[model samples]
Target: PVIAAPSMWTRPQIKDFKEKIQQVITVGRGEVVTVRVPTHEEGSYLFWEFATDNYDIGFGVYFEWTDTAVSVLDEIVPVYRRDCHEEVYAGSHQYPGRGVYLLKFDNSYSLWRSKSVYYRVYY
Candidate 1:
């Protein structure tokens, strides 16, 4: 029988090698954390995925650019979990310039102990 190996499921490389940001962070009660990706070229693509360990942990995600010190971020995912029809909270964005960018997470609404979260960013 033919077994499927990870090496057998690889995509062809079409672009130069880029950096990746991956972390499993534990955040404090009512605090914020920001993950920075340094200096992506214009038109470069960024993709991210994140999920919290518990249901009652609040979250906010943001994107900021270092060039003009401007941010195009919104929405604070509250501590309460959604019902049966819910998305995994992940998406991709395209870089607009050659500069540093940020992905901020806010967990300030949590009242109890620290909470753990998993995230990955690829560009």
Candidate 2:
């Protein structure tokens, strides 16, 4: 008989999003693409995975607080250049409450290159 170590306890999977949205988009030079993700349930996790075709691209996430009267946004992930061509970029964030979230892919810095992006978003 062997005793199981407390630290080695098996972790159970929690119920998460049942479906995912996947897309392939072309980000024109000096343009930005924003994917709107609306969540109805609080405390759910928003997950994203993406990759670019041949170069790096800017990636970020923002939480929309309201639709009007001083539109507010809470930055969840700050815009940063991701080398997605070499490896896929994946991440997740827990929702504080039911609201709209933005998944932004910025190609504004590219003067001549349009980036092809493949991405998946789920919650």
Candidate 3:
């Protein structure tokens, strides 16, 4: 279980850290939400957290590569999933190469009729 809190994370090799994305969203069954974050050849670091406001809910994460200007993509790669929970989820991912990356979350398999979620993505 992850909570919305703060910590100044640092590693000897890391510099110029920044917050990437933060959002609170609500979705019904069979709905999908997506966000794109630009990446680099050196890759990007990712941290994300999400949770619903009701009983048990279902959610997932996916990613794809695109260009700098407009959105382009292949298939979204699956990353995370939360099932039967009312708790916050936190995790990280690393990207590779200089281009764009698509982050996607699906609420299509929700256990209930609807779900309200709060999430943050940082890279």
Candidate 4:
């Protein structure tokens, strides 16, 4: 992947991101969906795929979008796992601290051009 600028990413954020990759979603067309932030693996390229299972529908950094906040690159969206019974179309938010980059993600989004996060960054 490319070089990320510096920012204060938290331990919980990293841990959360790493463990959740395969998200089960029944999102509607053009639903403006958000996914759980996966662990930012050091030296691993961090980004998103628009289409669930298609790289052709995905984009990596550098050639990715700017002036666009469609991807959940920096922020983690946490949703409650619904129905220990059957799959559901949508999940609910437990209001568990919502706001990205107030510390780091915002910085990263600002430096989306140079592709570097700012301020306090952790490894």
Candidate 5:
């Protein structure tokens, strides 16, 4: 079995983090999305998958990637166990079926609203 991996994140204090998930990403870039809750006060989770797309549902990221080899990363480009799901309503679909994913921060600035990117991925 290919193990799904996601970088760990220390979620910043938020009054309503789960509620803020709706706006976690300002743009969709044309992909259907869904969300799941593994725990409370923990980082939020998101899922995006498409059958037409070559790759499965990775993560919904919110960062700018200049290069694949080297990233002058301003953010992590969040990813998780959510790698592709055809069934929208069904819960048991896609790779890395169920797992906890988190965001990674540089700790240079506040983890919250740090131009941080969010995306999903699998390995």
Candidate 6:
């Protein structure tokens, strides 16, 4: 058996470059708003935060591989209903590879109510 020495733990540091995109969009009834963002050779991480005006909204992220002839999308974040009007929803994902990324806000569930979304994306 071996004895271990005492160790100090520290928090990881993240530097914000502030390369960001901000937008406000309205998702009409039975509609889905897809924000297409293309990353060439810049950042390895995608960070996003969003809030809704009055009700919950569906949000998701997908990655598209450019070389594939067949149209397919790899779901990074699965689509789910989020109560962004009560609290701001925020998350981040690391890039699998360089390609186009899609941010989808779905309002299709509500037949009458449209949702206003305020969002910011950091590359």
Q: How close is candidate 5 to the true structure, as a TM-score?
A: 0.19
lDDT of 6 at 83: 75
Query: Per-model C-alpha lDDT, please?
Result: 0.44, 0.67, 0.47, 0.23, 0.28, 0.67
What are the runs in model 3 whose C-alpha is more than 4 Å off?
Answer: 1-23, 40-43, 68-81
Most accurate candidate by TM-score: 6
Residue clash pairs of candidate 2: none
TM-score of each: 0.56, 0.74, 0.56, 0.20, 0.19, 0.74
Candidate 5: count of backbone clashes, pairs at least 3 residues apart or interchain: 15
lDDT (10s digit) by residue, model 6, range 4-76 = 2212111121112111224067788879988877655779777777777768999887787653111117777
Q: Tell me which residue pairs clash in candidate 1.
A: 30-108
Clash pairs (backbone) in predicted model 4: 5-116, 5-117, 7-120, 7-121, 8-120, 17-38, 17-39, 18-39, 101-105, 101-106
- Looking at model 5, which ten-residue stretch has the lowest summed lDDT? 84-93
Task: Give the backbone clash total of model 2.
Answer: 0
Any runs in candidate 1 off by more than 4 Å, and if so which?
1-23, 56-63, 67-87
Distance from true position, residue 53, model 3, in Å? 0.8
Worst 10 residues of 1 by lDDT: 1-10
Task: Report how far residue 64 has shifted in candidate 2, in Å.
Answer: 0.4
Candidate 4 ranges beyond 4 A from true positions: 1-23, 36-123
Pairs in steric clash, model 6: none
Each prediction's RMSD to truth = 12.8, 11.1, 10.1, 16.5, 15.0, 10.5
* Residue-pair clashes per candidate: 1, 0, 1, 10, 15, 0
Over the stretch 12-122, how does candidate 5's per-residue lDDT look in tens digits? 322233234335322133333433223223333343211111122334333222221112122224444332222211111122333432322122222232222233232
The reply for model 6, stretches above 4 Å from the true place, is 1-23, 67-72
Q: How many clashes would you count in candidate 3?
A: 1
